[PDB]
């Protein structure tokens, strides 16, 4: 695209930089333009861009929460049009960088990767994307949306758990079907029973680990404690 | 407050 | 300019919008909109102009730091250009967004301002942004940059000890000449003069003041102290 | 560390 004299190796090697810089507007354009060359990647070069694409996402959630919070104080004089209007902006930005992403998966990130670890790392992250787009859904597409999600999801789960051990932290990461069942899906049932079900098997399993990897996976079991504890 | 998703990898 | 189908209370409306979201990307351009309007500016819409162009240009001095840094490191194996590329690009970009500045002020914000405090501020504005270009500046232009900065901060300078009190917080924000001085011009002990005398005279004065005054202008004081604990 | 400049308004 955009990035298409430069070579694939001085892309990742930018991307690092501006990762350091805190500066991940270039970042995911270093990385959209590495995936664009056509070759699978690495383990090191997928975290990159989650890492970027979720920084940029990040800014936009946050911003788009403050505007529609003001919009509805404005409900229960009036300033104009102007809240309607600026909020309108920033969410269609944000529905741009989620599809964005989702074409890159499609296209053809997730039919060139055969191993587990590679399959479920993108089925994961476009479960994801679609998640973040019902956030902000109103229409008549809006169960649309809520269901491809939910089918993304569900295909990773069932490689997962034939596939790869209860503490991989890929596998943990479970997590977010969880908040997807509680926050959007209202079935707040369903996401209490999968995190005690989680939480429950990698447990029983730590004393197969070294102190490294331990660490990795306790990490994000204190996630799914601390979302048990403020859902009870 | 809102739930805990999953956080970035570095 | 890019904004010129909207009206110049809107562009107002949405620049405190985007200062509440922390979206000053946005904030910077519908203040840039408001100024082409051709009419003079109020207090309160002064400062919204300079907390939106100093948290934007304060994101690029941040990673030009970082970048360059590196760049130093990698001379006292060699990775490449990539380094020296990149650390050039943001360097591009900040010079870009203080020459969009210091050209509102030259068309036609300083001309047309004939109070002691609009004056003095956008006099002040202008030195602020000569510096900025001079901390990354390193040709034969350096020595000019660093002139022009100090023209228009003794402009300034002159102006507000004629026409304003001591304790003033414009007046006051004369911190920013003495660290001119001190980080830039090679002249630390006048940078130490400076910040002493204005504190006395300013401490000396506050027995006239408001609850409200006192406060503004201590905070400001504190800084000049800090410095000073700093460079003896 | 850099010496302190004159901070956001608000």
Chains 1, 3 share one sequence.
Not at chain 1, 121 to 130: A, I, R, V
Not at chain 1, 161 to 185: D, W
Not at chain 1, 217 to 228: A, E
């Amino acid at each position: 695209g955009a990035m298409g004299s430069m070579e694939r190796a001085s892309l990742i090697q930018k991307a690092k930089l501006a990762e350091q810089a805190e500066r991940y507007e270039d970042m995911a354009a270093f990385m959209k333009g590495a995936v664009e060359k056509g070759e699978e990647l690495s383990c090191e070069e997928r975290n990159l861009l989650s890492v970027a694409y979720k920084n940029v996402v990040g800014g936009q959630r946050a911003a788009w929460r403050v505007l529609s919070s003001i919009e509805q104080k404005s409900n229960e004089e009036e300033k104009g049009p102007e809240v309607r209007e600026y909020r309108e902006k920033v969410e269609t930005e944000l529905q741009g960088v989620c599809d964005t992403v989702l074409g890159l998966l499609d296209s053809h990130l997730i039919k060139e990767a055969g191993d587990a670890e590679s399959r479920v790392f993108y089925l994961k992250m476009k479960g994801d994307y679609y998640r973040y787009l019902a956030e902000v859904a109103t229409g008549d597409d809006k169960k649309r949306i809520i269901d491809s999600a939910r089918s993304a999801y569900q295909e990773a789960m069932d490689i997962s758990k034939k596939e790869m051990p209860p503490t991989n932290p890929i596998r943990l990461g479970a997590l977010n079907f969880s908040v997807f069942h509680y926050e959007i899906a209202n079935s707040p049932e369903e996401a209490i029973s999968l995190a005690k079900t989680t939480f429950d098997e990698a447990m029983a399993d730590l004393h197969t680990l070294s102190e490294d990897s331990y660490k990795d996976s306790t990490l994000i079991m204190q996630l799914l404690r601390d979302n048990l504890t403020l859902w009870t | 407050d809102r739930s805990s998703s999953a956080p970035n990898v570095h």
